Design an enzyme around this catalytic site. Sequence first.
Site, PDB file in Angstrom:
ATOM      1  N   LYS A 189      -9.325 -22.627   8.152  1.00 44.99           N
ATOM      2  CA  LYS A 189     -10.070 -21.733   7.259  1.00 44.99           C
ATOM      3  C   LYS A 189     -11.500 -21.590   7.793  1.00 44.99           C
ATOM      4  CE  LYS A 189     -12.012 -21.737   2.540  1.00 44.99           C
ATOM      5  NZ  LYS A 189     -12.568 -22.933   1.839  1.00 44.99           N
ATOM      6  N   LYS A 222      -6.691 -18.620   8.251  1.00 45.10           N
ATOM      7  CA  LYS A 222      -7.432 -17.623   7.470  1.00 45.10           C
ATOM      8  C   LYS A 222      -8.903 -17.627   7.821  1.00 45.10           C
ATOM      9  CE  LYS A 222      -8.997 -17.897   2.745  1.00 45.10           C
ATOM     10  NZ  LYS A 222      -9.163 -18.604   1.456  1.00 45.10           N
TER      11      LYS A 222
HETATM   12  C1  LIG Z   1      -9.090 -18.034   0.297  1.00 41.71           C
HETATM   13  C2  LIG Z   1      -8.873 -16.531   0.171  1.00 41.71           C
HETATM   14  C3  LIG Z   1     -10.173 -15.827  -0.166  1.00 41.71           C
HETATM   15  C4  LIG Z   1     -10.010 -14.324  -0.248  1.00 41.71           C
HETATM   16  O1  LIG Z   1      -8.903 -13.848  -0.571  1.00 41.71           O
HETATM   17  O2  LIG Z   1     -11.004 -13.610   0.006  1.00 41.71           O
HETATM   18  C5  LIG Z   1      -9.270 -18.819  -0.986  1.00 41.71           C
HETATM   19  C6  LIG Z   1      -9.289 -20.322  -0.733  1.00 41.71           C
HETATM   20  C7  LIG Z   1      -9.936 -20.799   0.564  1.00 41.71           C
HETATM   21  O3  LIG Z   1      -8.814 -21.165  -1.516  1.00 41.71           O
HETATM   22 ZN   LIG Z   2     -12.693 -24.635  -2.698  1.00 35.84          ZN
END
Ligand SMILES: *C(CCC(=O)O)CC(C)=O
Ligand SMILES: [Zn+2]
Lengths: 342, 342, 147, 342
Positions: free
Chosen positions: A210, A263
């Site tokens: 992330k 992500k």
């Molecule tokens: C991640 C997704 C954020 C978005 O859809 O803009 C959420 C998380 C890191 O829990």
């Molecule tokens: Zn968080």
Amino acid sequence: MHTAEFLETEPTEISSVLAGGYNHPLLRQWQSERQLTKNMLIFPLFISDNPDDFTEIDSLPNINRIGVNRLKDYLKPLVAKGLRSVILFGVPLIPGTKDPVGTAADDPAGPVIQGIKFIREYFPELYIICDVCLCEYTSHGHCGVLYDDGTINRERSVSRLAAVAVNYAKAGAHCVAPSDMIDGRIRDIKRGLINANLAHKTFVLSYAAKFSGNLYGPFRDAACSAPSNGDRKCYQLPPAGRGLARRALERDMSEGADGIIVKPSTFYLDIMRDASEICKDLPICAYHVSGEYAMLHAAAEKGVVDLKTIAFESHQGFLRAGARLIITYLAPEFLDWLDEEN
Amino acid sequence: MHTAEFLETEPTEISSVLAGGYNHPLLRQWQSERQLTKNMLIFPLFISDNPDDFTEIDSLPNINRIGVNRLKDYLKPLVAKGLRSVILFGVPLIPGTKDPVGTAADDPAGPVIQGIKFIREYFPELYIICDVCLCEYTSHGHCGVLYDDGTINRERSVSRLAAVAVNYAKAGAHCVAPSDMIDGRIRDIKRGLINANLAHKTFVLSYAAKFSGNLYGPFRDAACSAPSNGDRKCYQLPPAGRGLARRALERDMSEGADGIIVKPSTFYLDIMRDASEICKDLPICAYHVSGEYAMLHAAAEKGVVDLKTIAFESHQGFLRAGARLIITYLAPEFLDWLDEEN
Amino acid sequence: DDGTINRERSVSRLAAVAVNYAKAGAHCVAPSDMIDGRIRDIKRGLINANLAHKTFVLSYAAKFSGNLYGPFRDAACSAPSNGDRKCYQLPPAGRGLARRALERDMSEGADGIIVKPSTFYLDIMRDASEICKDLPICAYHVSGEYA
Amino acid sequence: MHTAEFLETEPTEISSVLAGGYNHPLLRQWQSERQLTKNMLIFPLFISDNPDDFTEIDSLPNINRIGVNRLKDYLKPLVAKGLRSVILFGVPLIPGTKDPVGTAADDPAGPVIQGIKFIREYFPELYIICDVCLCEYTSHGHCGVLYDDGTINRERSVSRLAAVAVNYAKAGAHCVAPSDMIDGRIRDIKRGLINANLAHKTFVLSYAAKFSGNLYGPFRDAACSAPSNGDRKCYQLPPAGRGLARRALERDMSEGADGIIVKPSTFYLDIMRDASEICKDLPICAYHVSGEYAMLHAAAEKGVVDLKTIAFESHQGFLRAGARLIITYLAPEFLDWLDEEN
Ligand SMILES: *C(CCC(=O)O)CC(C)=O
Ligand SMILES: [Zn+2]
Ligand SMILES: *C(CCC(=O)O)CC(C)=O
Ligand SMILES: *C(CCC(=O)O)CC(C)=O
Ligand SMILES: *C(CCC(=O)O)CC(C)=O
Ligand SMILES: [Zn+2]
Ligand SMILES: [Zn+2]
């Protein structure tokens, strides 16, 4: 007169000819590593404590704050079209709810656990996934227990995280996805699940890669956990941090993760590529963040690209980069698009 | 009272702790495989036959049709800020110019060759790159010589392509980049260059992985070669075609390419990743197509992301995916941004 | 007249038929002969016929001789006996040859490869999945496996 | 007249010619990675508590329930023809024998342990292998200790499994093969063996890759442990689960397994292939399950394939996929077939 020149060339080498493999429409499908199916989509949901809520965020059609009392009529159609899964995000709006230790995180009466019981009953075939974090429950908003110094206290936070995760599992959630980023949280959650004798029923879908960046805008507006713009980035991987991302993947997998999430998605396609080798034995999921999807809508609005087309191109991009699962706000749409055939 | 639970955890494993490597701003730079420099940017230019032109396309600030007579005052500042290279795109507007064999392609009096002579004189340090294709010169608009059947005639087209390429080199262009996609064109151009005794002075920057899709909108408006929307895709790789893309890279490199270009960029980051292994010894260039850049502007307009931030994130994305060169319409901007320091 | 297969003649013949099918309107040609080098000759023929950019060459790269083509022989009428006169049919234990045949056909122009039989040769599609990692791999559930 | 056309071809490339290596019958043997020997076959046996039993199952000639009193005359010939090993399966028929904890599993007076003492005496050269599981001894029939909830209790079951395994070893069995599938059982059995000071005498032949499916029909009829048709699949790997299968192999090997078994065989040949790389240093065994063998008989019956031929093709298939050991009900036959020579 300037005439059209043509150079002297040799006979065609077979090894130059690739066109024989992609000259037909059906061949363009034949050439893909994996095809897009409806049971590959995970629709995100933002449960509100107001059981009668239904608020649209930033004008984005597939980003709403829904209360338990509206959840049926909203999920009904979706499940009818083939939706097989959803990832729960709790948004406690009631005053004096959030605090320093995100106590409300596993509140048996909160949107998350209540959402689980609801779904588990009104839609027994649906696969429930729960995002695990303290960000939407802590007074400060960060994804963990911070010191008075501001910084995050690993041990405390992680111990807290394992608690919430296991509680969701105990509530009936099939899968837990910690999006915190705190080092070692995956191992502590796996252990907790093991001790809770739930490790053999709960899929641990870790947010292994992330990255911090400029694409979580919309989501922050809806989940209410307001980190500013992009300064206080907890365990959020720097965008250029490929090395760390690769190490985080090997770590989470080694700590018990049954699947990993990358992500953002589009802006991190080479990362799913790396993950596809590192976690070659684990399902890889791409998360089309709120900002990327809000970006597709914008460009489409200004007529820079066709919405339905760029969605297919982008999403197939996930599959091509190595992903076999996709969390996206376009799920309602795809559940329709994927049908148009026969 | 629902209380905040905390699970029983073990001592922290060193192998879980990665945060020691990215907790400082300077460390976030330390973690990147390669840093972004100004001499990594290639600014695209669209030369018009009207030596006094200067038309802005689709409202996009860094997409203009300029005639030779305006080229100085436009390139002056840019080169002053550090621009070290540009990729020429010819847009012959004069009537009855285009034809079946793209005769005007290497027209010594066309925008391209005239643009070369201009630059080579008014800016001797600039590195000139010329896109090689028949699309902007053929009556039909496609990137090659088609049969009455409509389809592309490989042999004829490729023989034509080698001619134009070599002619650009003869005109003074340092590098040629064929964006056609016709099988084997790289080998024929390399040969032509060899026979023209120019192979040791001309860098062959092949468009090895050019995918067909919904992102070339703006560019078509400006280059005037109007393929429709997205149906007549010549040798354009299907978006899901990773296999073909990998094979095309091994082919072009084997045929003489000194460097390869991946495009689009952002939506094909995993592909630069694959290229970074296949063409591990060749410079890899990413092309931030007109549609991706027009997409950043749109979202920024609707305030979905900050323009300057998403540009850095996206561009650093190229570098991270393996690229070391970048063709982008944001070059003017970066030539500024890259400075802000000291 | 010796009985054996004459590579050159046969292969030259094969390229002819293949190209003719393409000329007839067939999108793809799949040579199941097994004669060495036929893929290259068919690719060339297609190239000269200016059809190489429209015809997918789906080579039967790994076709093993065995006890599973029974039904099919009954229907296609081409009756090789039971299992003695096996032309270029790969011996079942021939993994090495199968791997080499895959690298050969791909190198000769094949746009995709077929493995057959399927079930009884799953490890072979596995090998193919690495060798021809960039080409579509097709499995053929032969008449005998289905029967 | 439609005439036979012949295209213009070039001289034969040496690299196309492979036929020089397989044009002779002896060469077809030369081309195999490994040849089939009699000491590679493991004949399965189903011992009954009725010392005078001898029941044929489903009409399959090499699937019988034999009591200790018939074991001699049955094993006599087999061992004479070269049989070097057998894998014991206990079938306690006496009423009120099975229970919740599979107590009878290591019953010193049960078919298994009694079978060991018998063999160890009446055939000292034979290598005894014992399948380790609770499925044929538990009241419910599953391969482990389940909760009242129905599910399997890992810890309890695994602790139970190590007990039975070690007891078989103590009884005289040379090798133990746990076919349960419960996570971590291999490590617990290895430890138990270590503590029992038997680890240096007992080969641990783990059922590392046992997939759930439609091929265990016959066997269920004979072993009497009746899971239904195919719903209650304990730790049985889903057929599409290649990732899990690869992980299970690395796990079991890491936990002490001295050799691994893949099953089913034929329908999982690519898996032995994967195993051949993962467990490249360990003997790999293929299990021609009761259903595959019953399938060969059926097709042969309807004259779809010759029995003796399809057996050789299928079995050589195991060897080719990477296996060097084979558990099969065709052992009696092969012990004959492998002889026909000289
Ligand atoms: C991640 C997704 C954020 C978005 O859809 O803009 C959420 C998380 C890191 O829990
Ligand atoms: Zn968080
Ligand atoms: C590619 C770039 C198109 C764009 O900027 O939208 C032009 C080419 C393939 O020559
Ligand atoms: C292969 C398939 C035979 C069958 O279905 O039994 C035919 C071929 C080699 O052309
Ligand atoms: C596996 C073999 C079943 C059969 O032969 O059909 C038995 C086991 C898993 O212990
Ligand atoms: Zn073109
Ligand atoms: Zn069992």
